[PDB]
């Protein structure tokens, strides 16, 4: 009963390419090599231990799910984020005037800080007063 969960389960399944139902340290090393993600030794132990909440050396799906959910639960699907930008760009321009979003994202809802809104600009304000927002979206769904 949720699209986030199904996506996390699909990912876990790809990471379980031995089909055992769990990820060992040995297996996680292989997964990182497969997908070309580089992690230094300290960061590897940290990431494994983050996922392996029971500390038994094996990451079960529910453990992975809990961890990914904690960090990603407030994200949405690509389509929902696209539509949310479309509120502020009713035509299909792919561009929103930076003074228009700024007042929206800084004043409405759970207001962003100027530094979060500045990091956001660091991604998608390619011109001087215009935000492309696809530069942000595509960094999450490449």
């Amino acid at each position: 009963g949720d699209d986030q969960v199904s996506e996390f389960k699909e990912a876990f399944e790809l990471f379980d390419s031995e089909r055992t139902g769990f990820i060992t340290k040995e297996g996680l090393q292989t997964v990182l090599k497969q997908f070309g993600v580089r992690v230094e030794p300290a960061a590897f132990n940290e990431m494994f231990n983050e996922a392996d909440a029971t500390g038994n050396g094996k990451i079960q799906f529910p453990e992975f799910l809990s961890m990914m959910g904690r960090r990603m639960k407030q994200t949405t699907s690509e389509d929902i984020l696209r539509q949310a930008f479309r509120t502020f760009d009713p035509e299909g321009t792919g561009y929103i005037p930076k003074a228009a979003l700024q007042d929206a994202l800084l004043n409405l809802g759970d207001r962003l800080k100027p530094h979060e809104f500045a990091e956001f600009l660091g991604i998608t304000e390619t011109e001087k007063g215009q935000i492309r927002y696809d530069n942000f979206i595509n960094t999450m769904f490449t």
């Binding site: 996506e7 990431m47 960090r71 407030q74 994200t75 809802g109 960094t139 999450m140």
Partner: protein, 63 residues
């Protein structure tokens, strides 16, 4: 007279419609802003997280 009295219900319902109209606009803007905020805040929190990098690499392979 009696006309002043009978139109008050029409005035009440008219105000209602105007406010519901204004509110749809304001709510659409706030809901959309919230989705964007939630997504930015999350991304900035996990962008350098190894599990994110791995998940992001796997995502195109998922149904």
């Amino acid at each position: 007279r009696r006309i002043g009295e009978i139109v008050k219900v029409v005035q009440a319902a008219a105000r209602g419609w105007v406010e519901r109209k204004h509110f749809r606009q304001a709510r659409e803007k706030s809901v959309s802003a919230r989705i964007i905020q939630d997504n930015i805040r999350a991304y900035l929190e996990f962008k350098n997280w190894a599990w994110w990098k791995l998940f992001a690499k796997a995502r195109p392979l998922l149904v």
